[PDB]
């Protein structure tokens, strides 16, 4: 029954929590890469090539 | 006309606390404020609108819980006070920009 | 007796390095919190 | 009265300097440790005075803080304290003993 | 330039909580490297007992 969340202010609430929430998944996204030295994903990146 | 007509000089906001301790008064007053732009800013007026938003509440308000704003409501609802106010005092370039409220000596915490 | 002898010599080198970064650093930020309780100016009055 | 009391009174004189609780301008029934007969009288104080010790205690406990002290002028002179507290715990002992004189019976 | 470097600093990556910890974590990964390099690089220098050893010993 989530029909009590649909609708117009709802809607511009989810809009004003989108950077937040993009930046925050940024917050994670090099936090579990640079935590776990993602191969993969860091060779890309220029100076942490320790290889 | 001529000389000896001097200009206002800027005034330092600070920010910091005054607190004066009284134990017995019934009520505790507290007065908090961030810097606000003054007189001429055009600023003032969405500063206006979002004060409205917040409000006031006092006491003798028919209608608590059911109030629109969200301070008043929560306040009204659990008795986190007996009055509040927002403001927008103006001077010459700088303000006080805020809200001040009346409690119980356990509900300043939840009030602030 | 103790193959692990230069290595630990070489985080040793790191930890002092570290602490030697992260000790003030914490200090300081321990300094400005307690900033508000330092330079707290008491006055007392009395009725009368 | 001669140098005898004098000289006990020196004595004395020179611990309390030593104590050292006057250089945080508190007095001796101020570092009185608070037991029942203690939070009692505390308790009947009047007015002016338990509003004098908590802002005495105050200072003190701001000093100890930033592990400072009070400029020499302001230190607490022997001869000028006050004992305060004293009679009202006296009383408070006097009448606790005398319920526990009746407790025996 | 001074000022405005903090300030700077203050505004484009510290209010946000996001980009403020954005930033620590981006500040985490060149860092942790740029430090194991000199430090290592330190290790070395007041040293030199063990790995030019290798030079010579193999190359085959």
């Known amino acids: 029954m989530l029909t009590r969340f649909l609708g117009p202010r709802y809607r511009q609430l989810a809009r004003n929590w989108v950077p937040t929430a993009q930046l925050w998944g940024a917050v994670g996204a090099v936090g579990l890469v640079w935590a776990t030295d993602w191969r993969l994903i860091l060779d890309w990146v220029p100076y942490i090539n320790g290889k | ?112 | ?48 | ?105 | 330039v001074a000022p405005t470097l903090t300030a700077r600093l203050y505004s484009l990556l510290f209010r946000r909580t996001s980009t403020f910890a954005l930033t620590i974590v981006v500040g985490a990964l060149f860092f942790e490297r740029a430090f194991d390099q000199g430090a290592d690089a330190i290790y070395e220098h007041i040293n030199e007992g063990k790995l030019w050893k290798h030079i010579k010993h193999k190359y085959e």
């Open chain 3, 1 to 48: 007796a103790e193959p692990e002898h230069d290595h630990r010599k070489r985080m040793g080198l790191k930890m002092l390095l570290m602490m030697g970064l992260l000790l003030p650093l914490v200090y300081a930020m321990k300094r400005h919190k307690w900033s508000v309780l330092k330079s707290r100016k008491l006055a007392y009055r009395p009725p009368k």
């Open chain 4, 1 to 105: 009265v001669s140098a005898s009391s004098r000289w006990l009174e020196g004595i004395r004189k020179w611990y309390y300097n030593a104590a050292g609780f006057n250089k945080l301008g508190l007095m001796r029934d101020d570092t009185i440790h608070e037991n029942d007969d203690v939070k009692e009288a505390i308790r009947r104080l009047p007015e002016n005075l338990y509003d004098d010790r908590v802002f005495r205690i105050k200072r003190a406990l701001d000093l100890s803080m930033r592990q400072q002290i009070l400029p020499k002028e302001q230190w607490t002179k022997y001869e000028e304290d006050k004992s305060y507290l004293e009679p009202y715990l006296k009383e408070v002992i006097r009448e606790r003993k005398e319920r526990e004189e009746w407790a025996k019976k």
């Open chain 2, 1 to 112: 006309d001529e000389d000896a007509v001097p200009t206002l000089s800027p005034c330092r906001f600070t920010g910091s606390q005054i607190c004066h301790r009284e134990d017995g008064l019934p009520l505790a007053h507290v007065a908090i404020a961030v810097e606000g732009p003054g007189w001429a800013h055009p600023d003032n007026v969405a500063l206006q609108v979002a004060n409205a938003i917040i409000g006031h509440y006092d006491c003798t308000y028919g209608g608590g819980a059911h109030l629109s704003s969200p301070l008043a409501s929560i306040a009204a609802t659990n008795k986190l006070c007996q009055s509040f106010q927002t403001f927008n005092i103006c001077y010459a370039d700088t303000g006080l920009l805020g809200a001040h409220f009346v409690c119980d000596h356990m509900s300043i915490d939840d009030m602030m």
